């Protein structure tokens, strides 16, 4: 907004593991204010992922995230007659959220049956550096690279 920046509101960590990032992820996943279901889904996926990849639940989730975080994004300035995309370094708070949102969109898109299972597959892909979220991440990077001249 124009006038005042405001402090971000408080977020509680999730009951199972006691973490803020996961709570944010479940929030992102949720729909229609239905939290209990969304967090159950998140837990189910997590369990499947842990089974697949070994490591802790959390650690695996974090790894998967790392593989879809963007260093740089682009924004439209357009000072000229035609529009110019300008890269910008994306801040720590934002990048994490973007990766989450990206994972969740991929899960929505996938063709598997259960939501939790789809999310799980998406996380596995991110860990392996395939899937959908990684592609979109790549595309973002690629656009930035193309418009690197602008800075």
């Amino acid at each position: 907004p124009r006038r005042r920046v405001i402090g971000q509101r408080k977020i509680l960590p999730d009951p199972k593991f006691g973490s803020e990032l996961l709570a944010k992820f479940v929030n992102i996943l949720m729909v229609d204010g239905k939290k209990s279901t969304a967090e159950s889904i998140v837990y189910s996926a997590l369990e499947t992922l842990a089974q697949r990849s070994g490591k802790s639940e959390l650690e695996a989730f974090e790894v998967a995230l790392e593989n879809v975080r963007p260093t740089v994004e682009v924004k439209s300035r357009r000072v000229g007659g035609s529009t110019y995309q300008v890269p910008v370094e994306v801040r720590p708070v934002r990048r994490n959220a973007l990766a989450m949102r990206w994972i969740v969109e991929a899960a929505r898109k996938r063709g598997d049956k259960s939501m939790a299972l789809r999310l799980a597959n998406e996380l596995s892909d991110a860990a392996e550096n395939k899937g959908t979220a990684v592609k979109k991440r790549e595309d973002v990077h690629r656009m930035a690279e193309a418009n690197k001249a602008f800075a």
Binding site: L12, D14, P15, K16, K35, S36
Partner: peptide, 8 residues
């Protein structure tokens, strides 16, 4: 029944 409630 909710875990979150128990936690809080």
């Amino acid at each position: 029944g909710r875990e979150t409630a128990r936690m809080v």
